[PDB]
Amino acid sequence: MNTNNIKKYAPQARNQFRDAVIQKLTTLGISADKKGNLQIADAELVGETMRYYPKSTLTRRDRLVKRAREQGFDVLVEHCAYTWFNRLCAIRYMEIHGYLDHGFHMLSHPDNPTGFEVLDHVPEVAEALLPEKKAQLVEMKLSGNQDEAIYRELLLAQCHALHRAMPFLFEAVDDEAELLLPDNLTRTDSILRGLVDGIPEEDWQEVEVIGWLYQFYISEKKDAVIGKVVKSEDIPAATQLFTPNWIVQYLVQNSVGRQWLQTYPDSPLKGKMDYYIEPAEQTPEVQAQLAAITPASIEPESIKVLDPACGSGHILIEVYNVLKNIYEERGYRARDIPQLILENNIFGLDIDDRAAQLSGFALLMMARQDDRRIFTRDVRLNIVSLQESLHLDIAKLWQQLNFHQQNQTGSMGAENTALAHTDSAEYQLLMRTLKRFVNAKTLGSLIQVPQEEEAELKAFLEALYRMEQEGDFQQKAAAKAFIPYIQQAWILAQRYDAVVANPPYMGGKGMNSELKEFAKNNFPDSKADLFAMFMQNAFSLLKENGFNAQVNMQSWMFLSSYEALRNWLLDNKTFITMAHLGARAFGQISGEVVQTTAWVIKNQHSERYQPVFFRLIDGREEVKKSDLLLRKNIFDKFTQHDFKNIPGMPIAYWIDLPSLLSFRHHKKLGEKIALKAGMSTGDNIKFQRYWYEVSIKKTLITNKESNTKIDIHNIKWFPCSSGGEYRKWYGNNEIVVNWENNGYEIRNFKFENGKTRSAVRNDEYYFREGITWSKISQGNFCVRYRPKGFVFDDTGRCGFSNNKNELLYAAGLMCTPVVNHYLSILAPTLSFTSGELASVPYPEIEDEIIELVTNAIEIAKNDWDSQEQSWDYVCSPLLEHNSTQLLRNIYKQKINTNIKLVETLLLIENTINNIFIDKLQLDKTIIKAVLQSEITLLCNPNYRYKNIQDHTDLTNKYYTDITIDILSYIIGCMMGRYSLDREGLVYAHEGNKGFAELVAEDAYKTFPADNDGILPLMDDEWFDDDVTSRVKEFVRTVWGEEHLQENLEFIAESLCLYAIKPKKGESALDTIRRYLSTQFWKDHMKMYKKRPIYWLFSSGKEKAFECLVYLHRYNDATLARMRTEYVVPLLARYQANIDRLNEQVDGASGGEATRLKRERDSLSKKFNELRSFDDRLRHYADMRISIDLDDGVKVNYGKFGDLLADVKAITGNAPEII
Ligand SMILES: C[S@@+](CC[C@H](N)C(=O)[O-])C[C@H]1O[C@@H](n2cnc3c(N)ncnc32)[C@H](O)[C@@H]1O
């Protein structure tokens, strides 16, 4: 069958049917305004008509006004449009299979694509349906022009004809419902055509279509009610799916068919059950147990099955099929089985009056596929939809009932007449029943009813059937009103051999006010979501040896918020079989939003029982099915007693055995170590910084050059562990938080009313030595060491211990694939909090691992401290070897050192993993050894460039970041941030203050530092303090005028590698200059994560003047000096050559004069752009803008409007063009 047709039609069909009811209700007068307030205006009385229509069609009219005032105008239309659609859908299905007694098609015409067969056989069709109006209808057909009048009469006559067998869908007292039937049913634009035209006939063969009609009708109102709280009337929309047939079979066959096969093991139904999971080999003790409960025989018509949420009845249809083959096998006549199944075996509930309308239809269409006279028998269907009790005239009906026959009939009977036999066990049983179904359109089948009231209700019910059949008008009007409630109560008091359902799914963030309190007070173990309450309630609906079988979300197997429930299941019930599906089990939902599992749980507790699991998480819907059938991916080694060894007690069949026997033999991790969540500052943008953004004087960072005692009164910034990226031993020392005055600002940080926004937690553990981890990590789990002088927030959780060895032995553990083996178990998410991480095992201490971890952390710390983004940065790693050697040879010397360390840490990490795996007695096959690509070091090209698979292009890209990093360090020495003479960071505080002292102290005597802190970054050599100029002065001052040219050609060779595009004949010197003016800005953006310490003042898009400015060295007089000594003298040289280039264009010709014009044209564009960058720099230079370094980089960079480059990529806001 092709759903793609129904999926497109049914949503459109819903709304279609709805406007046709509004348009007919507007005539009917029942109407609401835009605000949902109802309007009557009563009804005109033009003699014997009600103009807006007959006046016998008034009373009936005045019962819509009644019901609409009882529910909701929106509701009315949403229901009645559905009922008719369900009716017409029921007719369409039934006319294709020729189920009609008159044997003519009703909605279509076989030999005419546009017509209606009931129109040409008016005499025959009328003879069957309306024998009295035959002379009239044969007269209107002979008028040939009243077909819409005629067809409106036969079609209404057909639905009436179907009320005898299907009273739940085709009601007969629907009087008002006839006034809402649309006209023009006989036109090419009737609503009817889409129902026929949108669905080919082959889609109608099988019955599942009923469920796809079901699922796509309401699909649209679903997309409007998701994410929000769901109204009591929107529930059927928001929770309505459709189970694949292969899951239902697995559910029905492993519950119903299980019990039958449990008594008659050599039943040929086992071959007829493809999804029947055979029982695993039990211990002799359980083997004695199960035989003691299985009855020696089961009679077929003693089995009773319940779907509490049938929906389309898709599950009942399969129960019907499983029961069908049980009756055949027992020796029962063919025709007699449907009645016995639908009356003695199949019972179903739901809240959507219109979902039952389809479900019962579906069972009757399966029954009509087997017995032609099931439509002649009084077949009571136990498929009912739940009804509220806020609209009953209870005192009016119990006196209309005359159950004990109190009114001797005939005594014409007063507004104070004491309700007689209010003490009768039919009244007290009736009132207790009407009190249980108050908000039935909200609770559904979760309402329990005591089994003790079973007998009294059925005897009351059958009597309510009798008196519906033998009684007078009041007793038949009355006893017809009470049956829906006495029946639905009778279904709830009854217990069943198997409950099969695909329950509804709704987390505790769409439940409405009414529903929530019902969960806290009645289902505390499973108050989180609906599907769980159905799981725990369904057990209250089974016999002792009964089977609960559902297909549920998987979260009840893991989330600690179900621990009380998971604890409850293991103690009282017996898991039988479970097929864990995971995602994409339903081939018609989109997104990884739905993860499921189907299971069967006996209502008896057996300890030593051996259940069978199927891990079918992979593939589309088709695959799990194929692997389920082929019995791929089977687990049958763990009893339900074994799953109690895991903190929280997760259903965790995927576990093996030595990992289960290690939770019991060893001690918990977060027990030993104080897993503490950090503060929550409330605002990470106000309080947290990158350490390079602020003055090093104003940080708790102990510099290698400030022996002056850190005055803890001037200290504003303290290094803060704030989450970050994966890392296995030490990095991420990048965030500093504002902790001045012991956090006076974070502590008093309040909202508007007075409540406190931040959440300073565990501030006793601050500045301690400990570890840390990304609380949130996409990949594996990893921890890093954390020295003293740090704080930490909630994004960077930290464990602490008093023993440094345990602090390392833990840090060595929490980084293995072994830990990521457990964290899969306790909580398969990306959240690595302090609660599941605390339940991790943790064995005795070995002294070997503590050295391997000390070596590993210093390998990792040496790795981290090597970049200029770290505070502990000393100098560029090239400057560790002799300064006579050739530069290309020093590159080679450094790479070989960087591969040995990867192997060492890899051999260390794998030695650590292999030691833990030996102690916990684990399986090295499950825990793979660490690979070189996972060694979390920045010198490992495999890890830094995960995306590049090559070796050459991997090696080249490595040489390339190596050549850029040495350029940003030289640009660093130009500004004054580092120095050859002095180890470590040199100058980094506000206002260019104290820089000059350093110069007088020969802080930069080897390589001089730029005077003003303005470096022109240009593509041709104008100034002498140009960047590309001083770089050569650097290489010359370091490696030798001897080597200058090959070291420079090798730099040219290496920039060209990945950084920029080479050019033939381009000197080493030109090659370098090109990079700096164009690409360096971007790499420095990336290098500092869009937080530049060197600011590129840019004239504009012609790159007429670009200069770098070091952030710390900035003062008021800079933009005045920037204009005095750079922007002013440069606009003078541009002119003395536009004039010299015009002395040559007139003195040249041919190919050279066209070359001097493009050199004069290009030079004049850079003269107008730097003329308006001067008109705009003079603007910002007068302002004497003086910065504050504590403010941040995203703020100051907007203070200059568009003078700087990438103002909208750094600040976010487009540059404010002053
Ligand atoms: C049961 S599943 C759909 C049934 C479908 N035949 C299948 O294969 O699963 C979702 C349906 O459950 C229905 N349902 C039944 N009983 C319910 C209850 N007590 N509360 C809410 N929804 C309920 C909802 O109306 C919704 O349409």
Numbering used by the authors: 1 to 52, 57 to 417, 421 to 1225
The authors write:
Following crystallisation and data collection, an Alphafold model of PglX was used as a search model for molecular replacement, assisting the solution and refinement of the crystallographic structure of Salmonella PglX bound to S-adenosyl-L-methionine (SAM), a co-factor for methylation. The structure was refined using all data collected up to 3.5 Å. The crystal structure contains two copies of PglX in the asymmetric unit, the smallest repeating unit of the crystal. However, the arrangement of the two copies allows only weak interactions that are likely formed due to interactions within the crystal rather than being biologically significant. The architecture of PglX presents two distinct domains, N-terminal and C-terminal, linked by a central short hinge region (residues 654–659). Due to absence of available density, two short loop regions were unable to be modelled (residues 53–56 and 418–420), but otherwise the full PglX protein was resolved. Within this homologous domain of PglX (residues 227–661) sit the amino-methyltransferase motif I GxG residues implicated in SAM binding (residues 315–317), and adenine specific motif IV responsible for interacting with a flipped-out adenine base from the target DNA (NPPY; residues 509–512). PglX eluted from the SEC column at 11.2 ml, which indicated a hydrodynamic radius of 54.8 Å, matching the 57 Å calculated hydrodynamic radius of PglX. These data indicate that PglX exists as a monomer in solution, supporting our conclusions from the PglX-SAM structure.
